[PDB]
Write a protein that holds these residues in place. Structure first.
Motif, PDB file in Angstrom:
ATOM      1  N   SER C  92       0.834  -1.195   0.000  1.00 52.06           N
ATOM      2  CA  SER C  92       0.000   0.000   0.000  1.00 52.06           C
ATOM      3  C   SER C  92       0.870   1.247   0.000  1.00 52.06           C
ATOM      4  O   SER C  92       0.756   2.101  -0.887  1.00 52.06           O
ATOM      5  CB  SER C  92      -0.931  -0.009   1.213  1.00 52.06           C
ATOM      6  OG  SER C  92      -1.682  -1.209   1.274  1.00 52.06           O
ATOM      7  N   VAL C 154      -5.645   5.882  -2.722  1.00 56.19           N
ATOM      8  CA  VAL C 154      -4.883   4.672  -2.449  1.00 56.19           C
ATOM      9  C   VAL C 154      -4.581   4.565  -0.965  1.00 56.19           C
ATOM     10  O   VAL C 154      -4.563   3.468  -0.406  1.00 56.19           O
ATOM     11  CB  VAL C 154      -3.598   4.644  -3.288  1.00 56.19           C
ATOM     12  CG1 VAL C 154      -2.688   3.548  -2.796  1.00 56.19           C
ATOM     13  CG2 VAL C 154      -3.931   4.436  -4.751  1.00 56.19           C
ATOM     14  N   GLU C 179      -6.864  -1.095  -4.727  1.00 58.08           N
ATOM     15  CA  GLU C 179      -5.716  -0.200  -4.800  1.00 58.08           C
ATOM     16  C   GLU C 179      -5.234  -0.072  -6.235  1.00 58.08           C
ATOM     17  O   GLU C 179      -4.992   1.036  -6.725  1.00 58.08           O
ATOM     18  CB  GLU C 179      -4.592  -0.702  -3.896  1.00 58.08           C
ATOM     19  CG  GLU C 179      -4.957  -0.743  -2.429  1.00 58.08           C
ATOM     20  CD  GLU C 179      -3.762  -0.523  -1.528  1.00 58.08           C
ATOM     21  OE1 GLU C 179      -3.270   0.622  -1.460  1.00 58.08           O
ATOM     22  OE2 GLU C 179      -3.313  -1.492  -0.884  1.00 58.08           O
TER      23      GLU C 179
END
Ligand SMILES: CCCCCCCCCCCCCCCCCC(=O)OC[C@H](COP(=O)([O-])OCC[N+](C)(C)C)OC(=O)CCCCCCCCCCCCCCCCC
Ligand SMILES: CCCCCCCCCCCCCCCCCC(=O)OC[C@H](COP(=O)([O-])OCC[N+](C)(C)C)OC(=O)CCCCCCCCCCCCCCCCC
Ligand SMILES: CCCCCCCCCCCCCCCCCC(=O)OC[C@H](COP(=O)([O-])OCC[N+](C)(C)C)OC(=O)CCCCCCCCCCCCCCCCC
Ligand SMILES: CCCCCCCCCCCCCCCCCC(=O)OC[C@H](COP(=O)([O-])OCC[N+](C)(C)C)OC(=O)CCCCCCCCCCCCCCCCC
Ligand SMILES: CCCCCCCCCCCCCCCCCCCC(=O)O[C@H](COC(=O)CCCCCCCCCCCCCC)COP(=O)(O)OCCN
Ligand SMILES: CCCCCCCCCCCCCCCCCCCC(=O)O[C@H](COC(=O)CCCCCCCCCCCCCC)COP(=O)(O)OCCN
Ligand SMILES: CCCCCCCCCCCCCCCCCCCC(=O)O[C@H](COC(=O)CCCCCCCCCCCCCC)COP(=O)(O)OCCN
Ligand SMILES: CC(C)CCC[C@@H](C)[C@H]1CC[C@H]2[C@@H]3CC=C4C[C@@H](O)CC[C@]4(C)[C@H]3CC[C@]12C
Ligand SMILES: CC(C)CCC[C@@H](C)[C@H]1CC[C@H]2[C@@H]3CC=C4C[C@@H](O)CC[C@]4(C)[C@H]3CC[C@]12C
Ligand SMILES: CC(C)CCC[C@@H](C)[C@H]1CC[C@H]2[C@@H]3CC=C4C[C@@H](O)CC[C@]4(C)[C@H]3CC[C@]12C
Ligand SMILES: CC(C)CCC[C@@H](C)[C@H]1CC[C@H]2[C@@H]3CC=C4C[C@@H](O)CC[C@]4(C)[C@H]3CC[C@]12C
Ligand SMILES: CC(C)CCC[C@@H](C)[C@H]1CC[C@H]2[C@@H]3CC=C4C[C@@H](O)CC[C@]4(C)[C@H]3CC[C@]12C
Ligand SMILES: CC(C)CCC[C@@H](C)[C@H]1CC[C@H]2[C@@H]3CC=C4C[C@@H](O)CC[C@]4(C)[C@H]3CC[C@]12C
Ligand SMILES: CC(C)CCC[C@@H](C)[C@H]1CC[C@H]2[C@@H]3CC=C4C[C@@H](O)CC[C@]4(C)[C@H]3CC[C@]12C
Ligand SMILES: CC(C)CCC[C@@H](C)[C@H]1CC[C@H]2[C@@H]3CC=C4C[C@@H](O)CC[C@]4(C)[C@H]3CC[C@]12C
Ligand SMILES: CC(C)CCC[C@@H](C)[C@H]1CC[C@H]2[C@@H]3CC=C4C[C@@H](O)CC[C@]4(C)[C@H]3CC[C@]12C
Lengths: 350, 150, 203, 39, 150, 150, 51, 150, 150
Positions: C92, C154, C179
């Motif tokens: 991430s 995101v 994402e």
């Protein structure tokens, strides 16, 4: 929308993650079955050691008692909540303080009950709920004077705002302690609902339903329990919180209610409560109305975790762990008293 | 010849088409994703289906891109003020329609994903509503094209 | 909401002033003084181009940092009880940082299009230079704001995925898809920026 | 006139930097200190 | 013999007509969306029946689109300042009338779908109210047409 | 030849590079500091280990200072508008990048100091995030070095 | 900015040091890291003013 | 001869008469629909009688429409700037008076429908208040006509 | 002779006289309506007697209408800039005086009707206070008429 996504994690993201991690440790259905299959409280501790609880009960004396288990569970919950509170900032700190007001309202009732009956206030602290501890010294060494205790509450306790529902310290000796407690809880619930609505965003969305159900169940059970008592309808209607979904003409009808059939008729207008009343057979061997309300409360608290950027997760976790502690104590009671038949009465969570 | 500053409005049209459509798509994806992630712990088998709203939000971005590309290909340093204004209008239309559609898709997708976590029968309903929101972005694209090609 | 009150007051005062000023200019037959041409033309193209580059980099970095902290707070909160998160969910963060990278790249792709004029008269500066400045500014805006929104999105999705991972390991692999979608927007912006400065030539 | 090209450029630069400074100051002013410490 | 910036306003008509309407529609499709989700958990059989608000909100968007396309087809390089002002007025009228109608439709639809889960008889009532809200948008369209086809 | 105000923008760039970066660093040095003060009551031994966020915040300031100096040493009396606005762009880049990176470092460090207090294994994890945040500011600086020396 | 940082850090540190004395040195370090920020500004200011 | 910007104020009068009246009617309809939904849970038989607020809100929109159409019919290429000012004043008057009347109708109707669920005798009183909250829009209309037909 | 823009201030005066007065009266009516809805549940037979504050707000609206019509009948094409300013001042005076009077009437009427539910003797007092608020609007009208007839 309030866009809590953009700024929530600035101050409360770490605590959001931490409280969700704590919630991940609440006993699941399988753990509840494992504990249900135990034979002795020692075996209960053994089966509980494999869960998130771990060695919270290893130190205590080998001849375990249900009181010891309950005290240890309450201590663990208090420690976790205090740790979360100490790391929380202004808005979340106010939210957690509002959570603790619920127990402060019972503790102050205990204090006034002891003072009026002339028992040392310092000797009542041990029986108070830890989450509502009166660390303030203004309400200590009161010398058993109700007026001094009332002044102490007003000056050095967050309940001063809720004590303006009363009119004077004489009310302490005038109104029954139950009426005082219920009036304080009504004021506290209204303040909590207003605070959550002001917070807005996902907090309001995920927290207003829980407070609304709290108000509605308070109204229903105050109506049902007060039928055979001297509590008049006019004084009864003062105890109904105004946050619930019954506020327009629902609370009024409950106040006019004079029988459980009429309460059921009032609930019929609301399908979510209609189902709870229908399932509450109330005859021996099946779930009572309070158990159905507990199931609905657990459901609402569980649904509070589907939202992400909100403070309702902390209240939901506190209530879910309270219910888990009550379930474990109930299982221990069923084990000790050998009443296995009702051992399934615990309300499962997750 | 034409004005020196004529290309400014076409440039801003392309920039708006991309920026506001990206804002809408980003909000839709963020809201839908934060709903989906929170649902998944309860209903882990739904994630894939629940990815549908995200895709819809993504489509909004594409619309912007499409129009942006048009405005970025038909924009020379000497375009008439009329064509520059047309491109600015097309860009604003697509960008802000995509922004509104992205907000609607985020809200509807989050709510419907949670409801499906609680009520599977809602799935189809959610899709319908999402389409009704998605179409909004499409509408903008149409208008944008009509303005950008003219 | 004191600061919000200040911002709202400034916004309302500015736009009421703008409405009244436009009404006065239009009605008093003084529209010729409201030369938007003069503003867009006398204002140096260098201002537009350098604001474009600065925004291309700074807004991309702002989005990357926003997403990084949004998802890092959740990662480090969840990992207290499930430390495995710190190992798996760095992806991430990576995505967020990727946004910033695009920024600098586009900054370069924009900064390579700059060149002095040696002219000050708008006829001398010319359509080519004015359009170069405007298009560099527009490409900077596009890349910077698209990257800002992509990074924030995101980050939000990554925080959600980290909270989901803390409770069930087999969910992140299926939530990363979101994402990826949230990342595409960034790329789109870059593409558009590259299309805006494809035929830009100062000098 | 009310504005000139130099004044316009300076005002736009100062406006962008005032936006940035307002963002920074808003985030700094949001800083809060803990009201309690662990036992 | 007309200003070359005359088309600007006309464009800002078209754009606006498609933008604001979309925003309004989005709000509708958003709020009603949430409402449906909230009421779908307990009363699944009403999901399709309770999709009327979204549909009405969708229609609002169409209104804007119509006007936008109309304006986008009435634009010309030599458009007089008068016709450009007419198109800007039509665009603002349709867009903001649709925005108000979308707000009303969203609020009314959310409330009505939530209530109908508890009071079936309310359904028809909701529809009536929704129609009224829809009519507002229609009014805008009418005015827009009158302004956009002079 | 060149306007007498051409040196303004560049100067502001330099000042901006110093100011915003400092603000960023300040926020970091604040947030992390608060976190450390919260952590150190129970885990004093981690104070030195947990001082890394502050240091990184400081690094951000250094970057700004560098650029500021790099611009403050290049401001000549006849600084052309091209160089002036190049330095303004470099200043904005470095300043806003340092501001954002300082915010990210502050928040992540304030979370990770407490997390490492709870779970030691998170320490390295926290660092693995902080550096990312830090380089965001670095990226700005890099672009500044590209601009002010274009 | 350095004054904001010093305010937050110094207040937190003086309140915590009442609990854990070992935090004192920690606080000081952080304060220095805040103080240098102002110093940095001063440096740049001089480099500009004495130019 | 006459200024070319007069048509701008004429179309602004028309679009204001429509937009602000539509916003007022939308607010009235939304508030009244929320009140009706809340009321009908316990008192279904009043779903229809409690629709009078919405109608009284819709009337406001009609007022605006009237003026708007009038302006949209009085517009021409060579309206004197004074005529454009008259049309703009009429539009603003009708639109904003209708906005205030719609706010009042929404609040009064919501309160009245909520109260009538508990006290039937309030209905008549409510109606009167709505009339007093509706004539306001009428007043605006009157003034608008006096300005529009002058 | 007279500037072509003179009538702008006159039309704005008429529009203000109507709009602000209508806003004040609408606020008064809304607050009084909420107060009456709250009152009527327990003491229904006071609804008709308690409609007075709404009537006073209506009278404020009528003040506004009177000034607006006066300005809209004294507004001519060759209106001197001085007379146009006079009419703008009359309109602003009446409109904002009526706005203040409507605010006072709304608050006072809400409080008085709520109290009279519990204390009958308060009724007369309320009326007095309302009159003391009403004259405020009257004062505005006075001034407006002077400025209109000057
Ligand atoms: C409160 C928060 C802090 C403030 C933040 C917002 C700041 C807003 C920035 C204001 C700058 C506006 C531009 C000024 C230049 C244009 C002026 C103009 O149109 O008139 C000159 C134009 C052009 O003038 P001219 O060209 O004939 O003059 C000759 C040229 N000069 C003067 C340069 C030699 O028209 C007029 O002549 C009008 C004369 C009357 C003045 C009318 C001004 C309009 C506003 C008046 C009321 C104030 C509005 C706000 C209301 C209250 C608050 C909500
Ligand atoms: C509720 C708010 C209160 C209303 C007033 C708000 C504040 C506005 C006042 C700002 C200060 C400006 C005062 C005038 C200064 C001198 C200007 C001057 O020399 O004028 C030359 C200007 C421009 O030059 P000119 O037109 O006179 O010269 C001829 C120019 N040619 C040949 C091109 C036509 O014209 C005037 O003579 C203007 C005189 C009156 C100006 C009055 C202020 C304008 C703004 C009024 C408010 C607008 C909204 C109205 C509706 C509000 C309702 C809520
Ligand atoms: C708050 C959200 C934004 C919307 C409101 C604010 C919009 C504008 C803000 C920017 C500053 C002002 C811009 C206008 C500058 C004036 C330009 C000019 O003089 O040229 C005009 C131009 C040209 O003027 P001209 O004098 O050259 O006339 C043409 C003459 N020939 C053809 C011979 C060259 O024409 C117009 O009138 C165009 C319309 C725009 C000007 C009016 C601005 C409107 C401001 C908002 C109030 C609207 C009134 C109605 C209120 C109710 C609304 C629903
Ligand atoms: C790190 C950033 C921190 C936050 C941002 C704050 C930055 C503020 C910087 C100072 C203001 C600069 C404004 C723009 C002007 C730049 C200079 C320029 O280009 O001018 C050359 C120009 C060149 O002129 P020219 O030649 O282009 O003009 C044409 C020719 N004449 C002049 C003859 C018509 O000359 C000037 O100096 C113009 C005057 C501009 C002055 C603007 C007013 C600024 C007011 C200061 C702020 C308020 C202070 C009080 C605050 C109260 C307490 C809180
Ligand atoms: C509404 C009526 C009409 C108003 C029209 C006039 C224009 C608006 C002026 C303000 C009017 C309302 C009053 C607000 C006062 C200021 C804001 C609140 C107080 C304040 O500033 O203190 C704290 C910020 O600290 C500070 O003191 C920092 C503020 C100073 C920063 C200056 C930088 C910004 C410059 C402007 C350019 C940027 C433009 C961006 C759009 C915020 O308090 P809190 O909310 O934390 O506590 C809650 C209570 N205060
Ligand atoms: C209801 C709300 C209000 C809606 C109405 C629209 C409001 C828009 C606000 C902008 C101002 C109104 C637009 C019309 C006025 C433009 C200025 C005309 C004045 C004029 O004569 O200037 C010409 C140059 O301007 C020009 O020709 C400039 C053309 C461009 C004008 C429009 C640009 C506005 C800014 C748009 C930004 C969009 C950003 C999107 C993100 C002269 O020039 P000349 O050639 O005769 O010179 C001769 C020198 N010797
Ligand atoms: C205390 C703190 C430090 C100081 C404050 C700094 C920060 C605030 C400054 C920001 C700017 C605010 C003021 C904006 C004024 C708008 C236009 C005024 C109308 C006007 O009369 O302008 C005419 C020209 O305008 C034109 O040509 C129209 C151009 C309009 C462009 C506006 C773009 C920026 C503002 C709005 C957008 C914001 C987002 C960023 C793009 C002047 O006529 P003249 O007689 O002088 O003409 C001479 C030759 N004809
Ligand atoms: C729908 C979106 C996602 C794009 C995917 C399909 C593409 C290939 C289609 C959809 C709409 C199409 C445009 C519609 C309108 C025009 C004007 C027409 O006279 C020729 C080409 C042109 C410019 C088309 C180009 C191709 C186009 C952009
Ligand atoms: C392609 C899929 C998504 C279907 C959606 C339709 C949209 C995107 C496209 C496909 C065909 C397109 C049309 C094709 C041709 C023209 C003629 C041109 O002078 C103006 C644009 C206009 C009128 C286009 C408008 C947009 C349009 C309708
Ligand atoms: C307080 C904030 C909102 C800004 C102040 C409003 C602005 C737009 C107003 C207030 C007073 C106005 C000035 C009043 C009088 C004149 C004289 C005239 O011959 C030229 C315009 C000029 C110089 C005006 C310009 C605009 C002005 C400065
Ligand atoms: C189903 C598809 C077509 C989209 C839904 C909206 C449709 C019905 C709308 C969108 C734009 C509209 C067009 C807009 C403009 C014109 C020009 C006018 O002089 C005749 C009608 C006509 C040709 C409209 C017909 C209806 C229309 C095609
Ligand atoms: C209930 C029905 C009639 C309304 C729904 C359709 C609306 C949008 C249509 C139907 C007939 C249309 C009218 C028919 C013809 C014209 C003439 C033209 O020069 C201006 C527009 C105007 C005056 C139209 C306005 C919009 C209108 C009223
Ligand atoms: C919903 C309905 C029943 C309410 C009333 C709306 C209709 C009938 C109104 C709104 C606009 C009105 C028009 C407004 C302006 C004109 C031009 C004028 O010179 C004569 C009448 C005429 C043509 C009006 C006729 C009636 C009209 C069409
Ligand atoms: C009687 C009450 C209920 C008012 C309802 C009708 C109102 C809204 C309308 C209908 C017809 C209108 C009139 C029609 C024509 C004229 C002549 C013109 O030169 C000035 C205005 C005046 C005198 C109008 C005033 C307002 C008016 C009377
Ligand atoms: C209940 C509401 C509608 C009250 C209306 C206000 C009345 C009293 C006012 C408003 C405007 C006034 C009119 C304004 C102008 C004229 C023309 C003049 O030559 C003689 C009187 C006359 C005809 C006035 C009569 C009274 C009047 C109609
Ligand atoms: C309802 C009432 C009390 C409100 C209005 C107050 C009355 C008394 C006032 C307000 C404005 C006044 C008018 C203002 C100006 C003039 C012009 C002068 O040459 C003769 C008197 C005359 C015509 C005044 C008569 C009295 C007047 C109408």
């Amino acid at each position: 929308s309030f866009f809590p996504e953009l700024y929530f994690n600035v101050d409360n993201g770490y605590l959001e993650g931490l409280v969700r991690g704590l919630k991940a440790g609440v006993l699941s259905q399988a753990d509840y079955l494992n504990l249900v299959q135990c034979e002795t409280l020692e075996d209960l501790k053994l089966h509980l050691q494999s869960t998130d609880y771990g060695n919270f009960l290893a130190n205590e004396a080998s001849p375990l008692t249900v009181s010891v288990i309950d005290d240890k569970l309450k201590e663990k919950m208090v420690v976790e909540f205090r740790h979360m509170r100490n790391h929380a900032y202004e808005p979340l700190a106010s939210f957690l303080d509002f959570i603790t007001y619920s127990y402060m309202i019972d503790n102050v009732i205990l204090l006034i009950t002891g003072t009026l009956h002339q028992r040392s206030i310092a000797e009542l602290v041990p029986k108070c709920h830890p989450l509502g501890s009166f660390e303030q010294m203004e309400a200590v060494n009161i010398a058993q004077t109700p007026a001094e205790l009332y002044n102490a509450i007003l000056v050095d306790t967050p309940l001063a705002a809720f004590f303006q529902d009363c009119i004077s310290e004489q009310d302490l000796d005038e109104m029954n302690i139950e009426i005082i407690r219920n009036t304080l809880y009504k004021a506290y619930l209204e303040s909590f609902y207003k605070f959550c609505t002001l917070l807005g965003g996902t907090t309001a969305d995920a927290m207003c339903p829980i407070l609304e159900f709290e108000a509605d169940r308070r109204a229903f059970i105050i109506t049902i329990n007060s039928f055979g008592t001297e509590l008049s309808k006019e004084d009864r209607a003062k105890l109904f919180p105004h946050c619930g979904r019954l506020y327009p003409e629902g609370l009024a009808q409950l106040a006019r209610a004079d029988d459980y059939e009429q309460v059921k008729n009032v609930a019929d207008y609301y399908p979510e409560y209609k189902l709870l009343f229908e399932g509450a057979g109330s005859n021996p061997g099946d779930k009572t109305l309070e158990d159905r309300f507990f199931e609905h409360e657990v459901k609402l608290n569980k649904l509070a975790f589907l939202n992400q950027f909100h403070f309702g997760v902390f209240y939901a976790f506190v209530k879910l762990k309270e219910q888990e502690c009550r379930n474990i104590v109930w299982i221990a009671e069923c084990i000790a008293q050998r009443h296995r038949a009702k051992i399934d009465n615990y309300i499962p969570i997750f | 010849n034409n004005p020196e500053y004529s290309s400014f409005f076409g440039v801003m049209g392309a920039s708006s088409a991309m920026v506001f459509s990206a804002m809408g798509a980003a909000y839709g994806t963020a809201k839908s994703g934060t709903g989906i992630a929170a649902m998944s712990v309860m209903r882990p088998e739904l994630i894939m289906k629940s990815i549908i709203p995200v895709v819809m939000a993504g489509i909004i971005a594409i619309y912007g891109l499409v129009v942006a590309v048009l405005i970025a290909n038909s924009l020379t340093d000497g375009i008439t003020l009329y064509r520059s204004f047309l491109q600015l209008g097309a860009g604003l239309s697509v960008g802000l329609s995509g922004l509104a559609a992205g907000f609607a898709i985020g809200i509807v997708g989050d709510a419907g994903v949670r409801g499906t976590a609680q009520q599977p029968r809602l799935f189809v309903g959610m899709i319908l509503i999402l389409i009704f929101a998605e179409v909004l972005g499409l509408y903008g694209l149409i208008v944008a094209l009509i303005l950008s090609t003219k | 909401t004191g600061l919000e009150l200040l911002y709202l007051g400034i916004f309302v005062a500015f736009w009421a002033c703008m409405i009244v000023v436009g009404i006065c200019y239009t009605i008093f037959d003084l529209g010729f003084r409201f030369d938007v041409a003069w503003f867009l033309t006398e204002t140096s193209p260098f201002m537009w181009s350098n604001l474009g580059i600065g925004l291309a980099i700074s807004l991309s970095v702002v989005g990357a940092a926003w997403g990084i902290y949004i998802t890092g707070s959740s990662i480090i909160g969840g990992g207290v009880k499930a430390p495995r998160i710190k190992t798996k969910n760095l992806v991430s963060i990576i995505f967020c940082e990727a946004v910033a990278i695009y920024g600098i790249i586009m900054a370069i792709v924009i900064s390579n299009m700059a060149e002095p004029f040696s002219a000050t008269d708008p006829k001398a500066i010319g359509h080519r230079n004015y359009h170069a400045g405007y298009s560099m500014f527009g490409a900077g805006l596009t890349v910077g704001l698209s990257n800002l929104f992509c990074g924030v999105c995101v980050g939000i999705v990554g925080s959600g995925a980290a909270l989901a991972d803390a409770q069930n390991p087999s969910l992140f692999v299926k939530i990363l898809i979101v994402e990826i979608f949230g990342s595409a927007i960034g790329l789109f912006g870059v593409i558009v920026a590259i299309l805006q400065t494809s035929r830009v030539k100062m000098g | 006139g009310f504005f000139s090209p130099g004044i316009w450029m300076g005002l736009l630069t100062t406006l962008f930097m005032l936006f940035i400074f307002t963002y920074g100051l808003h985030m700094i002013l949001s800083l809060k200190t803990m009201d309690r410490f662990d036992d």
